[PDB]
Symmetry: C3
Subunit: 136 residues, 3 copies
Amino acid sequence: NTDRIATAELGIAENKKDAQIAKAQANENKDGIAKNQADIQLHDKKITNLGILHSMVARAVGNNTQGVATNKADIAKNQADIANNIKNIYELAQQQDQHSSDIKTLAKVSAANTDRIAKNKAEADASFETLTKNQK
Amino acid sequence: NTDRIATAELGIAENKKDAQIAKAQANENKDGIAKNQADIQLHDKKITNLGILHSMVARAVGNNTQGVATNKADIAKNQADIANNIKNIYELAQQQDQHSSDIKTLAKVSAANTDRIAKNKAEADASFETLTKNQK
Amino acid sequence: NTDRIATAELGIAENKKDAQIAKAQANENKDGIAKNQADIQLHDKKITNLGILHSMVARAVGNNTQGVATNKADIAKNQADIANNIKNIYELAQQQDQHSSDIKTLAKVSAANTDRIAKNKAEADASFETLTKNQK
Ligand SMILES: [Cl-]
Ligand SMILES: [Cl-]
Ligand SMILES: [Cl-]
Ligand SMILES: [Cl-]
Ligand SMILES: [Cl-]
Ligand SMILES: [Cl-]
Ligand SMILES: [Cl-]
Ligand SMILES: [Cl-]
């Protein structure tokens, strides 16, 4: 039957093209998937590398946090000691000033004694001289 | 031949649908690939941004590690100096205490001298008085 | 028409296979897309986790940078104070050395006074003895 054959020929030509369309899209799709896969692989390496770098920094930061706290405590000790030394130097200055006063007072006394010893000696000698001359 | 035509019609209708199936899957697949591509693009920007942020932190951490070590050495110098000042203040206190002792000893001596000078003067004057009165 | 039927049968068998090819590729592609999607999902969680970890470290680093600067200023204050205490201890030593000199000078004077007082007393007593014996 000619009419049936005719219809069938058109259908087959349609199907040929539709299969072709599908096959072509599936080939393009195959390429897009391989590209995305490639990109994901590079991402995987980058993400793993960022993990490693984070761990590295974290460890360094840990050491620094410890070092800061340690330094802070040591500075505080230093500051307390310096404050103690300031007090002790102040007290030493006070005592030094006192000694300066003490020494000056003493210097005045011993100078007065030196003076008086010599004055008294001359008065005694002069008085012995008169009595000696009077006896003779 | 009618029997051949009949078989052929069924085959064509089968093929039509199978092509259609393929085309439909390939269209869905095309959409999934575009979505994954979109996601990968956003991932790319995020990963690049994390790289930059890591570099930034790394540089800051570098400066802090240096600052910790520097501060640690400077504290150590401070502590050694403070320990030296403690010794020197201790020695000064020792010498101050000695001077306090020295001054007191001296204060006692010069006071005894002052006393004796005056006592000896009175004894001399009283003795001159007797001899003077005896001569007359 | 037999020749038309014959050609048509070959075409249908070709189309059957081409549709099949397409369908098979589209099924493989469907699987590759699901796998890439799965990988992207894991990447998403990793990238989000790296964001969080970066923020965490950044905050710690911030605190350390502050702690370094603070410690640096406090050390500097300590160092200036220690330098001041060194000067003050030096001056105290100078004054102490002066006092040592002052005390020794004074010790020599008061010892000479003690000596002279006693010498002068003996000379006076001996001279009174002669005059007394002469009067009688
Ligand atoms: Cl067909
Ligand atoms: Cl004296
Ligand atoms: Cl520090
Ligand atoms: Cl310090
Ligand atoms: Cl100090
Ligand atoms: Cl596909
Ligand atoms: Cl994909
Ligand atoms: Cl840090």
